[PDB]
Structures are given as structure tokens and as C-alpha cells.
Amino acid sequence: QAKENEKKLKSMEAEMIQLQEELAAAERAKRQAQQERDELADEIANSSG
Amino acid sequence: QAKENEKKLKSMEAEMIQLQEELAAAERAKRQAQQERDELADEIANSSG
Amino acid sequence: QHLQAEKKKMQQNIQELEEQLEEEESARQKLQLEKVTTEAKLKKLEEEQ
Amino acid sequence: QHLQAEKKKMQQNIQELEEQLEEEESARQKLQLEKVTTEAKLKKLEEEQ
């Protein structure tokens, strides 16, 4: 069973690497989302003025 | 060794848990930006347009 | 017989304690990720509001 | 002597596991409290949204 516990850590490593890809893709969209959100926030303010 | 190997699993879980913290916030940022990139955009064409 | 029974009874306690660690760690790993993910979502949910 | 020596090791293993269970269980309880607080706060933001 000790190998099973080690396999769980190794299995989590594969999921951890996969999570990095999701975070990397999400981080790229999050950074771009802030620019689009800030643009709309400032654009909507200019429309009121 | 099973208990020691298990410590590495819980320690490695911090990486997956830490990545999920940034992934959840990064993924949620797209929803907040999309809700504002489209709502304000449609309103910008009505207010600014 | 006392040492054999004690060492045998103590061995069962280690199995019960080891089983509890696996169950406690299994729930802690999922609870820790849920707590961190929920905490990260809370920080992002506040920005959404 | 070999039985008592191995029997005493079981007590040390049980004691060594008790400190781990007490630490893991204590840390797990703290994570559950934070998850409940974050989940409750997240529900308020989601309801307001």
C-alpha cells in the first residue's frame, strides 16, 4: 500500500501539471480580461460624460 | 515510508490547491470581464452610440 | 501472551490510526482545496459584485 | 525483551500517529471553518449578483 500512497502523489503530479495548464490558460485570459474590463469601465464612464 | 510518502502527497496537494486558488480567481475574472465586456459594450452603443 | 496481545492490539490501533490518517488526510486534502478554492472565489466574487 | 521492545515500538508508533492525527485533524478543522465562512460569504455575493 505504500506504493499506492506514492502513486497518489505521482497521480497528483500529473493532475498538478494539468492544473498548471488550466491556470496558465486562465492566467492569460485573466490578464487580458482585466484590460478589457478596465477598457469597458473607462469607456462606459466616457459615454456618460 | 507510507506515512512519509503521504506527507509528500499532502505537500504536493498544496501546489494543486494553490494553483486552483489562482485558477479559480483567473477563471472567475473572465466571467466578470465578459459580463462587463458585453454589457457595457451593448450599452456603449446606446449611450456613446 | 500479554506482550503478544498488547503488540497485536497495539498493531490494530496503528492500523486504525493509519486508516484515520488516510481518511482524515483524504478529507483534509479535499477540504483544503475547497477552502482555498472557496477563499479564492470569495476574493474574486467580491470583485464580481 | 524482543516482544516488549517491539511492543513498546507500537506505543511509540501510536503516539507518533496521535501527534499527527491531532495536528492533521486540528488543521482540517481550521480549513472547514474557513470554507464555511468563505462559502457563506460567497453565497451572499452570488445572491446579490
UniProtKB/Swiss-Prot annotation, chains C, D:
Annotated localization: Cytoplasm, Cytoskeleton; Cytoplasm, Cell cortex; Cytoplasmic vesicle, Secretory vesicle, Cortical granule; Cell membrane
Q: N6-acetyllysine modification sites?
A: K44
The record's tissue-specificity note reads: In the kidney, expressed in the glomeruli. Also expressed in leukocytes.
User: What does its PTM field state?
Assistant: ISGylated. Ubiquitination.
The source's domain of life comes to Eukaryota
Biological role: Cellular myosin that appears to play a role in cytokinesis, cell shape, and specialized functions such as secretion and capping. Required for cortical actin clearance prior to oocyte exocytosis. Promotes cell motility in conjunction with S100A4. During cell spreading, plays an important role in cytoskeleton reorganization, focal contact formation (in the margins but not the central part of spreading cells), and lamellipodial retraction; this function is mechanically antagonized by MYH10.
> Domain notes, please?
The rodlike tail sequence is highly repetitive, showing cycles of a 28-residue repeat pattern composed of 4 heptapeptides, characteristic for alpha-helical coiled coils.
Quaternary arrangement and interactors, per the entry?
Answer: Myosin is a hexameric protein that consists of 2 heavy chain subunits (MHC), 2 alkali light chain subunits (MLC) and 2 regulatory light chain subunits (MLC-2). Interacts with RASIP1. Interacts with DDR1. Interacts with PDLIM2. Interacts with SVIL. Interacts with HTRA3. Interacts with Myo7a. Interacts with CFAP95. Interacts with LIMCH1; independently of the integration of MYH9 into the myosin complex. Interacts with RAB3A. Interacts with ZBED4. Interacts with S100A4; this interaction increases cell motility.
The record's disease note says: Macrothrombocytopenia and granulocyte inclusions with or without nephritis or sensorineural hearing loss: An autosomal dominant disorder characterized by thrombocytopenia, giant platelets and Dohle body-like inclusions in peripheral blood leukocytes with variable ultrastructural appearance. Some affected individuals lack leukocyte inclusion bodies on classic staining of peripheral blood smears. Alport syndrome-like features of nephritis, hearing loss, and eye abnormalities are present in some patients.
Q: Would you identify the family this protein belongs to, as annotated?
A: Belongs to the TRAFAC class myosin-kinesin ATPase superfamily. Myosin family.
Protein's recorded name? Myosin-9
Organism of origin is: Homo sapiens (Human)
Q: Which gene encodes it?
A: MYH9
**First-to-last residue of the parent protein present:** 932 to 980 of 1960
